[PDB]
Design a protein around this ligand. Structure first.
Ligand code: IRX
Length: 598
């Protein structure tokens, strides 16, 4: 699969989005009356549900685009040829049919994406914003070279220029998307799905019951009718809305960057904090009614519109990225990012006392460990590979588990609670180690405090003689559970290469028990396959080494329609909210918001 066709299909999909949103973008930028907007919204929201619930044929893309082209081409001729009286009827009919056609085209275009391997939805998300910014830039550039003749309350050159631009864009898109994207060719109840997760539908409805209530009608129509703003300024408020509506959609998508770590948080908190947006309502009434001079500046209106635009595109795409995470064990969320690790060891072997400090990072998603270990007491009388079992295998929380087995581990849930691990290490023909360690969150850093006692070690043995080679290998740690202590048991024998070619066996019996009072996930028999790499950093002088660890669990060898149904429910809810958030503005007609004529 070459990338040339990848880029070509990406460009085709972007062009589809461009020509789909160009009509609305150019119909909002010339302060057209409210009735045409409400008719267009009604058509767009009435066609889409019917198109969604029933599988329509997938062959009507070029015909729909051609119909849109001829409908838009009709406007320029009709506006001059027709007298305004019958021109109104043509406007309303064209707007209704344009709404229906655009809804049908967008719905049929979205469905064809999921069938292909790559995700297409991001491409429509990009294309809509690109259309908005492109129309705004074109309008701003054209504003400085058009005579304001004001034939029927609308500009003359602006209409022709914008509509021929739209026609050229649509014809390019249709001629570019035809030679691609070929078009040849147990059950469960639904109510429990609806009542299981309703925390997203309410937010996705209430965040669009307001934005489309305000910006169409009360956004700048009332302000223009009150303060009589110059025509040269109305083209800037809508642009300041469009640009930020486009730009405030990407930051929630990416989070691995350090600065954007606090954007996608939760739903209950989102629902209880969404009431901060309701403060916007008195602001528009206040700046439309009060005549005091501090409010008669373009800057504050632009700031308010920019704030509304930024808050619209950030409380609208969040639910699409959170519900899957919270569908459902507790404790895995603390494994999503890279977690720092601090290790402190105080050991005593055959009367030799020592302290070791180590720092590093762990990545549970990759299941990899990187660590630097240094001796704070100087040089160590015993080899550090012998303490590797103390250092790294004393922390198994960062091990990568397969998604099938991910719920099995207790390490995932215990680490927020903290746990205590004991280990008995037997060296063949030598002494033994007894190690007690605790691993638990200090601040935002996982810490491991370990005390080691070494006994019965011969002075001429492989350990005290420093006969161990500088290398480490791959092994398997066998883990079973113990119900009596509500903990886990583990056995593993580590082989150590000797400089003379021989092999030293070190048996390790390990018992892990949780520290906190919360319940744990008691597993069955399984093993962890681990690979260790030792390296020396030449830039430091003290006794130090770098340890890299690759851990993977093993031992033991549908329902996507629920996610599909949830996504469809969210989309339907958002469309219903958008429809219901237009007529509500007529309620404002009761109060005499408009300023007196003088
Ligand atoms: C993201 C998305 O997904 C879907 C979809 C999902 C599943 C099935 C079928 C369709 N539609 C959209 C979408 O176009 N939103 C913006 C729409 N409008 C109305 C047009 C211009 C302004 C008002 C507005 O903001």
């Amino acid at each position: 699969l070459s990338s040339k066709q990848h880029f070509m299909l990406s460009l085709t999909f972007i062009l589809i989005g461009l020509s789909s949103l160009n009509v609305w973008n150019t119909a909002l930028g010339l302060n057209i009356n409210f009735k045409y907007n409400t008719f267009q919204i009604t058509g767009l929201v009435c066609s889409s549900i019917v198109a969604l619930f029933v599988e329509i044929p997938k062959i009507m893309l070029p015909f729909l685009l051609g119909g849109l082209s001829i409908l838009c081409a009709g406007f320029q001729i009709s506006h001059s040829f027709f007298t305004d009286t019958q021109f109104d009827t043509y406007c309303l009919v064209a707007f209704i049919v344009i709404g229906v056609v655009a809804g049908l085209a967008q719905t049929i275009a979205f469905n064809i994406g999921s069938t292909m391997e790559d995700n297409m939805g991001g491409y429509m998300s990009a294309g809509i914003g690109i259309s908005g910014v492109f129309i705004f830039v074109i309008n701003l550039l054209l504003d400085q070279f058009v005579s304001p003749e004001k034939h029927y309350g609308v500009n003359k050159a602006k209409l022709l220029a914008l509509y021929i631009i739209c026609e050229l864009c649509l014809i390019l898109a249709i001629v570019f998307c035809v030679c691609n994207l070929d078009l040849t060719n147990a059950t469960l109840s639904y109510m429990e799905l609806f009542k299981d997760s309703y925390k997203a539908i309410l937010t996705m409805f209430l965040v669009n019951w307001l934005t489309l209530q305000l910006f169409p009608g009360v956004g700048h129509k009332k302000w223009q009718e009150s303060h009589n703003i110059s025509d040269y300024n109305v083209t800037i408020i809508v642009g300041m809305f469009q640009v930020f509506d486009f730009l405030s959609r990407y930051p929630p998508n990416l989070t691995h960057i350090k600065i954007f770590k606090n954007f996608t948080f939760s739903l209950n908190k989102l629902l209880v904090a969404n009431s901060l947006r309701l403060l916007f309502i008195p602001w528009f009434i206040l700046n439309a009614c009060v005549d005091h001079p501090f409010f008669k500046n373009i800057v504050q209106q632009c700031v308010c519109m920019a704030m509304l635009a930024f808050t619209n595109g950030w409380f609208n795409t969040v639910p699409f990225l959170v519900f899957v995470k919270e569908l459902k064990s507790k404790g895995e969320e603390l494994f999503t990012g890279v977690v720092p690790i601090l290790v402190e060891l105080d050991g005593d072997v055959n009367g030799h006392k020592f302290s070791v400090s180590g720092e590093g990072e762990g990545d549970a998603t990759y299941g990899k460990l990187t660590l630097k270990f240094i001796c704070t007491t100087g040089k160590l009388p015993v080899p550090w590979p012998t303490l590797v079992t103390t250092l790294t295998y004393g922390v198994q929380c960062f091990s990568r588990y397969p998604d099938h087995m991910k719920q099995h581990d207790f390490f995932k849930s215990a680490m927020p609670e903290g746990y205590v691990q004991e280990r008995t290490i037997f060296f063949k023909d030598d002494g033994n180690y007894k190690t007690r360690a605790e691993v638990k969150f200090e601040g935002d850093t996982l810490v491991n405090r370990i005390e080691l006692k070494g006994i019965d070690f011969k002075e001429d043995g492989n350990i005290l003689g420093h006969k161990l080679e500088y290398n480490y290998n791959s092994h398997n740690v066998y883990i079973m559970a113990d119900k009596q202590k509500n903990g886990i048991k583990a056995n593993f024998k580590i082989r150590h290469n000797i400089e003379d070619g021989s092999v030293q066996l070190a048996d390790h019996y390990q018992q892990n028990t949780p520290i906190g009072d919360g319940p744990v996930l008691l597993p069955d028999n399984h093993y962890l396959s681990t690979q260790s790499a030792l390296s020396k950093d030449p830039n430091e002088k003290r006794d130090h080494m770098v340890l890299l660890e690759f851990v993977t669990a093993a031992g033991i060898t549908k329902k996507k329609k629920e996610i599909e149904i949830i996504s469809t429910f969210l989309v339907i809810a958002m469309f219903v909210g958008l429809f219901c958030g237009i007529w509500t503005t007529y309620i404002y007609n009761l109060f005499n918001i408009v300023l007196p004529k003088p």
